Amino acid sequence: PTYTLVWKVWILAVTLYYAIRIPLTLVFPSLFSPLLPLDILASLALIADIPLDLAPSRLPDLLAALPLDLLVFALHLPSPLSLLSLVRLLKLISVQRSATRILSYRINPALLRLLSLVGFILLAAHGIACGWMSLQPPSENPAGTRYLSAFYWTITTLTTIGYGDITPSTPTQTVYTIVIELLGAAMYGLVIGNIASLVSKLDAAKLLHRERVERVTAFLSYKRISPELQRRIIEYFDYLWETRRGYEEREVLKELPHPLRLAVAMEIHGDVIEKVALFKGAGEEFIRDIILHLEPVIYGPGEYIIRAGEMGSDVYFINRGSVEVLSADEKTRYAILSEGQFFGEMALILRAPRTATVRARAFCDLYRLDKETFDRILSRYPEIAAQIQ
Amino acid sequence: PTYTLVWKVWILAVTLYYAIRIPLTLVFPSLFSPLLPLDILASLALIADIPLDLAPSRLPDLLAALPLDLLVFALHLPSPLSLLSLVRLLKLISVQRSATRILSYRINPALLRLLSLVGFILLAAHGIACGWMSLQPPSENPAGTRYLSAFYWTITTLTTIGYGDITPSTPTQTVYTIVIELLGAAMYGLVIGNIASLVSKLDAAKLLHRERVERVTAFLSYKRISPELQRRIIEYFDYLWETRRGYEEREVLKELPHPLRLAVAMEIHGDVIEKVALFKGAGEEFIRDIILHLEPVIYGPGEYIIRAGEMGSDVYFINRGSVEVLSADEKTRYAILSEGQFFGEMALILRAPRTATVRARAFCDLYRLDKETFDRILSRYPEIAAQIQ
Amino acid sequence: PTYTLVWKVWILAVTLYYAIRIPLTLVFPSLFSPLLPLDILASLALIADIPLDLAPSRLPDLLAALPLDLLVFALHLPSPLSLLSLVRLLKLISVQRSATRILSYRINPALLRLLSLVGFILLAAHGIACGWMSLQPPSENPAGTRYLSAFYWTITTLTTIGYGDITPSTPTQTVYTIVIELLGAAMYGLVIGNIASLVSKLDAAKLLHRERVERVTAFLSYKRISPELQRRIIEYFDYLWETRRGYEEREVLKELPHPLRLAVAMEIHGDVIEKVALFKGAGEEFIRDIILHLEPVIYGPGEYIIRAGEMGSDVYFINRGSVEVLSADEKTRYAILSEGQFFGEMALILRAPRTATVRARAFCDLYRLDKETFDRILSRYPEIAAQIQ
Amino acid sequence: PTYTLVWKVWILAVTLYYAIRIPLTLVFPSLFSPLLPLDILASLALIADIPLDLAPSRLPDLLAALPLDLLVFALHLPSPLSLLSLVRLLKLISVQRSATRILSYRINPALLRLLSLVGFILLAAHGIACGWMSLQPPSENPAGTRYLSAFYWTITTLTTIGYGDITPSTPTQTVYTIVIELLGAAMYGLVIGNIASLVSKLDAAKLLHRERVERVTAFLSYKRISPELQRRIIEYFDYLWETRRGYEEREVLKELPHPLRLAVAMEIHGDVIEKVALFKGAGEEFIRDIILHLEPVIYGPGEYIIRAGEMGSDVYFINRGSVEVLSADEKTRYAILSEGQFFGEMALILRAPRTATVRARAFCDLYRLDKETFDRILSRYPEIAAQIQ
Ligand SMILES: Nc1ncnc2c1ncn2[C@@H]1O[C@@H]2COP(=O)(O)O[C@H]2[C@H]1O
Ligand SMILES: Nc1ncnc2c1ncn2[C@@H]1O[C@@H]2COP(=O)(O)O[C@H]2[C@H]1O
Ligand SMILES: Nc1ncnc2c1ncn2[C@@H]1O[C@@H]2COP(=O)(O)O[C@H]2[C@H]1O
Ligand SMILES: Nc1ncnc2c1ncn2[C@@H]1O[C@@H]2COP(=O)(O)O[C@H]2[C@H]1O
């Protein structure tokens, strides 16, 4: 549903309202004007979200729900006790722990952590500036100019810049300053770390592939291999990057279980299926057993697949590329094949050698049957086995 | 035991006492008041821990135990020789090397390194501030205000902020300042590095899973596959994340040896065990041989497991989900199965085709027997083999 | 082709011209002198590149092509509206997205990202300094001295140094300063992250190898193994690092498909091929079947390969190193073999035990046949099988 | 040899002398006193190392050898031309590229890179401070106090601290300052990156093991397994960490080739070898064939290995731990076995069931024979096969 979503958003806005008012009031008690209605509404939202959640871990919600702030603000309390209203916070923890699940997949987790941290940083800067322009000699100056200098200071401190135009004078100012410096250096170490971890995973494939190619190459040069083969290999890896980004079909489809892998394979070879069982008569238990045995392979341009005098024994189904057939030795082409078709069948149904030569024309992406396996699951079905003659 | 633990804690507190007194005294010799008893107790603790340890590597303990400080403090020594009392340190090395083993597993090692580094940082700041408010023109000012400005300075320096409100005047001040700047830039590089390494390993599974899904998807789109199958795959991966966090059963149980793997499997299928060998009569050497051959598999909602005209030859044991049985083609359901039950048995004990259809209702988590293996270890036990008829 | 390349370079230079003039003019309207021709040429280049691209994603090109700047500059517009000329930017996005593909392989992607980021940084510094020396009390000072102080300021800010020699005075200055501080701390976090990710992948092999050796060693010492064997192992790993950088032949050649792997293997063992089939008569279907079964192995100096009383049954082809033959027990050497040669043949074609002993002399890199496989694919070809007698 | 080593060290010291004198002279021409002998010696060392190297890449050595500095220093040259003496540098590149190989293995490569970078940093700081105290109004002040302030400045700049006590006044000063700021921010990004990469690889095993345990656990809890088995598993992983640091024997010994693996295995089971072939009569071709088939396994305390009514068919050799034998059901122990011994033999040489029960007493580390393999390579040797009766 969405009501829980909009509700959590309302809780977020409420805790923001509190995080921003609480301290600004502790400094400027001239607020708490006929503006308590919003405080009451927010307290009600929190005390009405604590049960929903029920529909250690719940300790923050309990500490945030009770109005430990309305008292201190209504009945004037002194400086060291006027604090403890911040207990109305600690709901930000629940907010983060909720929105890290509501939005746990659609975006990188590191990015989400980074944004949360930045929000936390800015709220803390707002609180720290309030604390600073509290620890200052009282003067007659507008509250919009006392708050600007404080934000300027705490941002030059948290940022590790430190101009030096406005500095501590009294000791307590100095202790506050020390603590803020440490939190800034500790708040600036987290940002950099999250960012580094976020960029160290952007270009993964374009690094894995690069390392794999470097490995292959650096290994071949030790074997003192010709540059032509090196160039063929490099072209192969380029073609394998600019289509599927470097991934191998088998290792991938192995990450899936049997039914989904079968459905994939049956959505791939569907065309071939409507080009084989036409005059055969089988189906639904034979097509589904070989299809998991088809192993892929890629033949570059000009590479020989089948020669006119061998006994390969296998059969090849094309999926993407093209192919040309030729005579044994006179480079005369019978025809040209393309996707969907198939060849290598005779030497399977029949134990004769090959009758022609097969040379590719461009980068193929075809599949093949070992025939030890294909002939093994044919014997098991004797009807088609008789159909082959 | 715990006596060694509390003892190491006492040694830690003692070396802390020394790290904090040693320099503060070197600056303020007005200490060394009738406060030597604590120094004697700590020297005794160190000289009494050096033998326990015995119950290069031991060089620091030897240099820390001898009272090279009590002399210098008792018999007044000049400024360049009043040093060398810090030899009482170097016990922090033993402390770190001990507590990195006492607490080596219950918490992340990087976190522990980070906390140790921060403690080392603060102690060094305390020492550096002492050194600074030594290298200052002598004046009549309280010692609590001379120590605050020094800590403020060295924290603005180590932090890489550098306001500029208090700076070096004399040359030796300037050399001290240079060294502190370098140590700060070298002390601030370690913190950031530890933090980055600590956040680069929080969300591991939620990154491995994400990359695996991106790979699968980006590979399928190249094969021009329908979006329905893509959605089924995504739902599968979601269900596989929100239960076991992305981990595969086989790859995991493979990280264990044979006895623990067997005990696991026998705690899992225990229910099935009390639903099979009832009227059989076997046990303790047959149940324990098949159980290691049960391979898991997951069938999504609506996926066909068994059809009314095939010869699957296998048998399926359910563990978590549910299932429905149906006729061949008229979508009439005989009954509904749930966890603990089993089906697919007839075509195993008997070589007939299937008699019905089996379609899942929700995400199953079931197990299956190949039957090549099951029928192979049945033949080996001829008694049950006759029991099957 | 190259015309598209030089064209994209021209587009890059044009968008640079704009990024550098646009703001410098907004500050110094005394420009827009008889210097509009270059602006017209650049607008034409952009409006003429938008169609080529055609030969969301295209939104930036559309916003950059229309002359939303020529109006504002021709007809004088006020300060808050004189902006929006920067819409002529956003072409840098297309520039980056184009040059990240044009140069996606020849250099590390991280390095490219880093250089792009640095360029973006410097352009932003140029814009920010213009913005700063706009938000300054008007004075009579040369424009080359007002622009230097601004660049100095924004570089001391973006860099997180913050001397403090020139600072904000007015509030709007202060808000600008806050924003620049945040962007600097956010612009300095990206640089460090990219750099860390760029150095964390330089020494990969020299780290993988090191870890593998540490693992092997630390495992052996637990088994209380002699140091001699440890030294032999270390020498082996050194020799395996200083030739092929730690990579194993099989795992590597497995990253290739069958045809390229076959061509590799046939370029390697080519010499052996012209030393075997001389008096045999086979070829093109037997040489090509065993060659994929040759498994490599490395024998250190002094290691026994074959002893005079065993029945190894295998045959060894040498590729790089040398070897010595010897009698059974009297250390008398018959001859010495080197690369290209072969031995171990008799016990293959004949089922007698070995006749001599074979000890290496230096680090060999040889290959061997199991003979279960070699004798299996020989039977399949009965002609040579009769040729062996 | 070592002469080349000491020679490279001399070259290093010479290029250091030059890097430190060259600029300090360019600033203080009052040097070049009767101190030219050292310059001549260093030029000779460089011009005499250029040929040794011979016993693009050599361009730096050629540019460093010719005395492009002795002229400028002898015949007074003006300020913009008095430069180009730094060409005597660029030998540091050869120094780094040499010492990165001389010391490429004994220490982590990242540490070495870091130290090189730090040295480069300090030399650059020395040069930059010279350049700075050149770009200063000439005054009457000692050269040891003009050089201290410059080093202080450039270290507060390179470090990203920036106090602000001494700043640029003139424009050229300001441009120098800008460049130094960028180099510092670019010199401080490299240090942090190297450090992060150096700490991200310290605790590898103690992280891999931790992740593996988290995976196993988090997977079991989903299967709702008892806590007793969980505790047994945790104890197993602890014992497996505190002996061999988490590494598996098979995966490790698989990183070695056949001869070294054989020699390892024959140094391990050597005791067993002198406890088996005593009354047998075999050797050197039977012991060496089974030893590679022994598979390891670990049985925790109290785990049953063999029960008095099964037909395990296998045999177990102990290596480290202990074991107890017992009757079928009355917990009466016949004897107690320890390392070196063996059991499970009868049911191998004979096809009877087991005669007793075997329960471990502590963490064992034993090995076992499948017996399908052991009985297969026994048949091949018929002599011992008759010896078994
Ligand atoms: N004229 C042709 N046009 C297209 N394909 C052919 C032609 N002649 C033979 N082939 C195919 O090429 C294959 C090569 O030899 P096979 O015996 O494997 O079976 C052959 C046929 O499938
Ligand atoms: N009426 C039924 N209720 C539940 N399960 C059934 C029913 N009829 C058949 N089955 C099971 O469904 C299986 C499908 O075909 P099998 O031959 O494998 O064996 C069958 C039985 O185990
Ligand atoms: N005199 C020799 N010179 C070179 N190689 C030899 C000599 N005698 C035997 N060999 C080879 O050494 C091999 C060792 O025993 P094989 O039976 O395997 O076959 C033997 C021959 O190939
Ligand atoms: N009394 C004994 N003391 C020690 N080992 C024994 C004793 N009796 C039997 N065993 C061993 O325990 C083994 C258990 O059954 P096996 O048939 O495998 O062979 C047995 C012997 O090797």
From chain A residues 237-256, the ones with a CB under 8 A of any chain C CB are 238
Task: Point out the residue among B162, B164, B196 whose CB comes nearest to the CB of C196.
Answer: B196
Instruction: Please tell me the distance between residue D382's alpha carbon and the centre of ligand 4 in angstroms.
Output: 26
State the amino acid at position A224 in one-letter form.
R
Cβ contacts of A365 on chain B, cutoff 8 Å: none
Residue A133 among known ligand-binding residues: no
Distance of alpha carbon C164 from alpha carbon C169, whole angstroms: 12
A22-56 CB burial, b ≥16 within 10 A, e <16: bbbbbbeeeeeeeeeeebeebbebbeebbeeeeee
Cβ contacts of C109 on chain A, cutoff 8 Å: 203, 206-207
Q: In terms of C-beta density within 10 A (0-12 exposed, 13-18 middle, 19 or more buried), how is residue B200 classed?
A: buried
DSSP-derived secondary structure for D273-332: HTTTSTTT---SSSHHHHTTTPEE----TT-EEE-TT-----EEE-SSS-EEEE-SSS--
The pair phi, psi for residue D350, each rounded to 5°, is -140, 145
C201 touches chain B (CB under 8 A): no
Residues with CB under 6 A from ligand 1: A 306, 325, 334-335, 343-347, 354-356
Tell me the nearest-neighbour CA distance from C145 into chain A, angstroms.
Answer: 22
Cβ contacts of A164 on chain D, cutoff 8 Å: 163-164
CB neighbours of residue A71 within 10 Å: 12
Q: How many residues does chain B have?
A: 389
CB neighbours of residue B264 within 10 Å: 21
* A162 contacts D162? CB cut-off 8 A: yes
Residue B357 among known ligand-binding residues: no
* CA distances from residue C350 to A126, A166, B263, D124 in whole angstroms, order as listed: 90, 96, 51, 73
Task: Point out the residue among A160, A162, A196 whose CB comes nearest to the CB of D196.
Answer: A196
Cβ contacts of B156 on chain A, cutoff 8 Å: 162, 181
**Cα atoms in the Cβ-side hemisphere of radius 13 Å centred on C66:** 9
* 3 state SS for A20-45: HHHHHHHHCCCCCCCCHHHHHHHHHH
Distance of alpha carbon D318 from alpha carbon A328, whole angstroms: 64
Q: Which of B182, C204, C151 is nearest to D188 (CA)?
A: B182
Cβ contacts of C285 on chain A, cutoff 8 Å: 309-311
Q: Which of A45, A84, A81, A48 is nearest to A63 (CA)?
A: A84
Nearest CA to ligand 4 atom 11: D343
Nearest CA to ligand 1 atom 22: A343
Distance of alpha carbon B308 from alpha carbon B331, whole angstroms: 12
Q: Which two tokens stand for residue C294?
A: 């040759």
| CB-based contact D364:D318 (threshold 8 Å) | yes
Instruction: Please tell me the distance between residue D325's alpha carbon and the centre of ligand 4 in angstroms.
Output: 7
B103 touches chain C (CB under 8 A): no
Distance of alpha carbon B302 from alpha carbon B331, whole angstroms: 12
Tell me how many helices (H) and strands (E) chain B has: 18, 8
Interstrand relation of C304-306 and C357-360 (parallel, antiparallel or unpaired) = antiparallel
Q: Which of C273, C364, C348 is nearest to C311 (CA)?
A: C348
* C264 contacts A220? CB cut-off 8 A: yes
* D184 contacts C191? CB cut-off 8 A: no
Distance of alpha carbon A254 from alpha carbon B242, whole angstroms: 21
In the three-class reduction of DSSP (H, G, I as helix; E, B as strand; rest coil), residue B304 is classed as strand
* CA distances from residue A137 to A109, A134, A140, C89 in whole angstroms, order as listed: 45, 8, 10, 48
Element at B342 (helix H, strand E): strand B342-343
Ligand 3 binding pocket includes C88 (Cβ within 6 Å): no
B160: closest chain C residue by CA: C161
Distance of alpha carbon B316 from alpha carbon B348, whole angstroms: 11
In the three-class reduction of DSSP (H, G, I as helix; E, B as strand; rest coil), residue B299 is classed as coil
Element at B325 (helix H, strand E): strand B323-326
Cβ contacts of A203 on chain B, cutoff 8 Å: none
Angle, vertex CA D345, rays to CA D341 and CA D346, nearest 5: 140
Task: Point out the residue among A149, A159, A225 whose CB comes nearest to the CB of C267.
Answer: A225
Q: Which two tokens stand for residue B317?
A: 């044991």
Ligand approaching nearest to the C-alpha of A328: 1
Distance of alpha carbon C158 from alpha carbon C168, whole angstroms: 15
| CB-based contact A49:A7 (threshold 8 Å) | yes
Nearest CA to ligand 4 atom 20: D344
Q: How many residues does chain C have?
A: 389
Q: Which two tokens stand for residue A8?
A: 């959590």
Cα B256 vs. chain centroid, distance in angstroms? 19
Q: In terms of C-beta density within 10 A (0-12 exposed, 13-18 middle, 19 or more buried), how is residue A173 classed?
A: middle
Long-range contacts of C185-190 (CB under 8 A, 24+ apart): C185/A159, C185/A160, C185/A161, C185/A188, C185/A191, C185/C160, C186/A191, C187/C121, C187/C124, C187/C158, C188/C158, C188/C159, C188/C160, C188/D185, C189/A191, C189/A192, C189/A195, C190/A195, C190/A199, C190/C117
Ligand approaching nearest to the C-alpha of D350: 4
A179 touches chain B (CB under 8 A): no
* 3 state SS for chain C: CCHHHHHHHHHHHHHHHHHHHHHHHHHCCCCCCCCHHHHHHHHHHHHHHHHHHCCCCCHHHHHHHCCCCHHHHHCCCCHHHHCCHHHHCCHHHHHHHHHHHHCCCCCCHHHHHHHHHHHHHHHHHHHHHHHHCCCCCCCCCCHHHHHHHHHHHHHHHHCCCCCCCCCCCCHHHHHHHHHHHHHHHHHHHHHHHHHHHHHCCCCCHHHHHHHHHHHHHHHHHHCCCCHHHHHHHHHHHHHHHHHHCCCCHHHHHCCCCHHHHHHHHHHHCHHHHCCCCCCCCCCCCCHHHHCCCCEECCCCCCCEEECCCCCCCCEEECCCCCEEEECCCCCCCCCEECCCCEECCHHHHCCCCCCCEEEECCCCCCEEECCCCCCHHHHCCHHHHHHCC
A164 touches chain C (CB under 8 A): yes
What is the position in ligand 2's atom list of the atom closest to the CA of B335? 3
D370 Cβ contact partners less than 8 Å away, ≥ 6 residues apart: D293, D295, D314
> DSSP class of residue A106?
S
D219, D358, D366: best to mutate for the B interface, most B CBs within 10 A: D219
* CA distances from residue B142 to A382, B31, B139, D11 in whole angstroms, order as listed: 105, 15, 9, 55
* C201 contacts A196? CB cut-off 8 A: no
Cα C122 vs. chain centroid, distance in angstroms? 27
Residue A101 among known ligand-binding residues: no
CB neighbours of residue B58 within 10 Å: 11
Q: Please report all neighbours of C, defined by 3+ CB atom pairs within 8 A.
A: A, B, D
* CA distances from residue C43 to B64, C48, C50, D7, D234 in whole angstroms, order as listed: 76, 8, 11, 63, 70
D124 touches chain B (CB under 8 A): no
CB neighbours of residue A217 within 10 Å: 15
| CB-based contact C132:C26 (threshold 8 Å) | no
Resolution (A): 3.4
CB neighbours of residue C178 within 10 Å: 19
User: D358: which strand partners?
Assistant: D306, D325
Angle, vertex CA B38, rays to CA B36 and CA B41, nearest 5: 110
Q: Which of D241, D201, D253, D235 is nearest to D303 (CA)?
A: D235
Beta strands in chain A (DSSP E): 295-296, 304-306, 315-317, 323-326, 336-337, 342-343, 357-360, 367-369
Distance of alpha carbon C227 from alpha carbon A283, whole angstroms: 65
Ligand approaching nearest to the C-alpha of C333: 3
Q: Which of B313, B382, B317 is nearest to B349 (CA)?
A: B313
A157: closest chain D residue by CA: D161
Instruction: Please tell me the distance between residue C291's alpha carbon and the centre of ligand 3 in angstroms.
Output: 22
Ligand approaching nearest to the C-alpha of D325: 4
Distance of alpha carbon C16 from alpha carbon C33, whole angstroms: 19
Distance of alpha carbon D190 from alpha carbon D186, whole angstroms: 7
Cα B313 vs. chain centroid, distance in angstroms? 44
A161 touches chain B (CB under 8 A): yes
* A219 contacts C244? CB cut-off 8 A: yes
Nearest CA to ligand 2 atom 1: B334
Instruction: Please tell me the distance between residue A281's alpha carbon and the centre of ligand 2 in angstroms.
Output: 28
**Cα atoms in the Cβ-side hemisphere of radius 13 Å centred on A104:** 14
Tell me the nearest-neighbour CA distance from A184 into chain C, angstroms.
Answer: 11
| CB-based contact C158:C189 (threshold 8 Å) | no
Ligand 2 binding pocket includes B343 (Cβ within 6 Å): yes
